[PDB]
Design a binder for these strands. Structure first.
Lengths: 55, 119, 100, 112, 68, 96
RNA sequence: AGGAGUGGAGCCUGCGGCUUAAUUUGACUCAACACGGGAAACCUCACCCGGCCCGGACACGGACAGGAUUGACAGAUUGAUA
RNA sequence: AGCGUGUGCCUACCCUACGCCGGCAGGCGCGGGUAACCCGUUGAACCCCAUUCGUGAUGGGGAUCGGGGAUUGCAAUUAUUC
């Protein structure tokens, strides 16, 4: 009644269905190579992932 | 002196038709609306509007029982149901017929208030 | 008895070392050791806007993550190479040793 | 992610990142710090507590992961090992005009 | 700030005192005169009683709707 | 809030036997990833371990979206008493 | 110097204005305006017209373990198997 | 032709050959591929080749709209997209 009407979205597609791993924000997820990262956090912490602007 | 004119299926033939011959009767936009079959989730409210479709009141202009489902279809079974189709402000009430049929309820409802320009 | 020692490195100084030091030392043990096979680069290109917001000009990043793969052909049972490998291990290269 | 999380806790002991190496069914995850008398607390206590911190979250077996710590060789050079120096001197509550010129002099002491 | 929509309460529930006197009947002998139905449900033994509603009798946690 | 009083001690064993534990921050995960032995959803595991937080018997640490428990040595008095365990025996975090 | 263009036509979409239950909003000279990696049927979503759990940690206590409060279906309502 | 991507902690949603049904978008089997291995030898488009149309808003132009036909979806009417 409340509990069944608490998670009643089909949560298998849409930018709202997925979520960020750092921030839990529903915009700008890097869905290339399954980084699944808010682009603002990717920028900061890509230095210690291995992504470096060599060119 | 001519009646409502459907494909080649009258209203008695429409009211009593199996739900797999009914699939080959209306447009593909309405075929795959009702090809998938039954529903287990909150879409058991269409079942509950089929259950509320048998709220045909006594001999009178029939009452308005509400539907907050604009994806609900103008089914030929429904014909004889004054309807409460919500559009964010006002529940519309347009009398239904064989002419309407094979279409969505939300069509005959204006979600956006009609636009008029000033200066 | 084809051992197929997969050498995938982010760095060149270690991909040169791990491939060479498992041959340079494996010359003294006199086993029929081959040179390291090459695989082409995979430049994992993620091009992000520098700005967190949508204002200013559109200065794009070009985050280049190159990854390389080598493997060395052998005529050897497993234990002979295992005596050489785990001595002097460095963080760079992922050594996945194939038996078959 | 592991670099982010440990920085939130190990700031007081001079966090510098890791000198990590991978081995088959063992893990040399060095938490290379500056002051390691309170990375342990009571004779390797907090080091034993730091084990299943990392092991549990990422779905690792038991026996592989083992966490060591040293002093950073000339620990005045690593920036985040001396950002901790200006963190807990300004959170301590000395004026910025003194707590900086000590640590600026500390790297001319360390031959920067 | 003061809103227009009338503010909405939450009801102080019907909490029942001295429960055991009505569950069964009292008796002079060692037995007890049972009024309500017992629990033939799968999840519990013999502890749960079945209610006195108008249309049928209802168990606590089995969620089974009987008839006349 | 409603819990099972049974399913409070399905939280407290893994806290006790090793003095550190993990849980991802989310409301909608009925099957807890480490604790599938008993049905305790992620939202109920969150609310069970933040009841001990404010009275300061466990220090709560947070990464990206993940719960962590530096079980303080003030939580050892109450959780050998209430968990009903001898004062001699120690968790696997006091082992040599 | 010249080339391809743009402004001209129709459409795509960002902005203003007018409308609206809400037509969310940030940004307005190059350094706002297919910009927020924003191509929003739902989620996202901010806004609106409807309805819920308190998801009010914890401290104290008039009140509580001869019962505090709790989740739990017909049916009238209901969008509802709220 | 050349950048390239492709089976995902949460995670389900991958790339598609080849064979059958059908004009179409598409529906259905057996396999590969965590990939210099499989799609793919990426038979890319343009122009090139040869037919055809004839200075007219025409066979230029493809807007607006009607009826079907499937897919995606939990669902698309304020036509998703084809």
């Amino acid at each position: 009644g409340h509990q069944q009407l608490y998670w009643s979205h089909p949560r298998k597609f849409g930018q709202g269905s997925r979520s960020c791993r750092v921030c839990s924000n529903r915009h700008g997820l890097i869905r290339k190579y399954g980084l699944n990262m808010c682009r603002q956090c990717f920028r900061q912490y890509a230095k210690d992932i291995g992504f470096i602007k060599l060119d | 002196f001519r009646k409502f004119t459907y494909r080649g299926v009258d209203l008695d033939q429409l009211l009593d038709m199996s739900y797999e011959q009914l699939m080959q009767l209306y447009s593909a936009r309405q075929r795959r609306r009702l090809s998938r079959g039954l529903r287990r989730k909150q879409h058991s409210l269409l079942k509950r509007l089929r259950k509320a479709k048998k709220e045909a009141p006594p001999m009178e202009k029939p009452e308005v029982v509400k539907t907050h489902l604009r994806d609900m279809i103008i089914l030929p079974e429904m014909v004889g149901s004054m309807v409460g189709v919500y559009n964010g402000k006002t529940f519309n009430q347009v009398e239904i017929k064989p002419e309407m049929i094979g279409h969505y309820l939300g069509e005959f409802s204006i979600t956006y208030k009609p636009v008029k320009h000033g200066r | 008895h084809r051992i197929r020692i997969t050498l995938t490195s982010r760095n060149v100084k270690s991909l040169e070392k791990v491939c060479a030091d498992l041959i340079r030392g494996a010359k003294e043990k006199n086993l029929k050791v081959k040179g390291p096979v090459r695989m082409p680069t995979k430049t994992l290109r993620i091009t992000t806007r520098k700005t967190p917001c949508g204002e200013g000009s559109k200065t794009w990043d070009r985050f280049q993550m190159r990854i390389h793969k080598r493997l060395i052909d052998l005529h050897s049972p497993s234990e002979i190479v295992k005596q050489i490998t785990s001595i002097s291990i460095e963080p760079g290269v992922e050594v996945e040793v194939t038996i078959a | 992610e592991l670099n982010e999380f440990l920085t939130r806790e190990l700031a007081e002991d001079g966090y510098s990142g890791v000198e990590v190496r991978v081995t088959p069914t063992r893990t040399e995850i060095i938490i290379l710090a500056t002051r390691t008398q309170n990375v342990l607390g009571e004779k390797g206590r907090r080091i034993r507590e730091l084990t299943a911190v990392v092991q549990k979250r990422f779905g690792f077996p038991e026996g592989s992961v083992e966490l060591y710590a040293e002093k950073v060789a000339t620990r005045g050079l690593c920036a985040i090992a001396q950002a901790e120096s200006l963190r807990y001197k300004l959170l301590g509550g000395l004026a910025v005009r003194r707590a900086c010129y000590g640590v600026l002099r500390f790297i001319m002491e360390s031959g920067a | 700030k003061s809103y227009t929509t009338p503010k909405k309460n939450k009801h102080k529930r019907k909490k029942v005192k001295l429960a055991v006197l009505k569950y069964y009947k009292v008796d002079e002998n060692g037995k007890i005169s049972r009024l309500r139905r017992e629990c033939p449900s799968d999840e519990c033994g013999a502890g749960v009683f079945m209610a006195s509603h108008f249309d049928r009798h209802y168990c606590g946690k089995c969620c089974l709707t009987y008839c006349f | 809030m409603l819990m099972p009083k049974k399913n409070r001690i399905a939280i407290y064993e893994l806290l006790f036997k090793e003095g550190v534990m993990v849980a991802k921050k989310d409301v909608h995960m009925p099957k807890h990833p480490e604790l599938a032995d008993k049905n305790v959803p992620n939202l109920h595991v969150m609310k069970a371990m933040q009841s001990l937080k404010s009275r300061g018997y466990v220090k709560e640490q947070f990464a990206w979206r993940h719960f962590y428990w530096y079980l303080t040595n003030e939580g050892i008095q109450y959780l050998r008493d209430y968990l009903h365990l001898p004062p001699e025996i120690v968790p696997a975090t006091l082992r040599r």
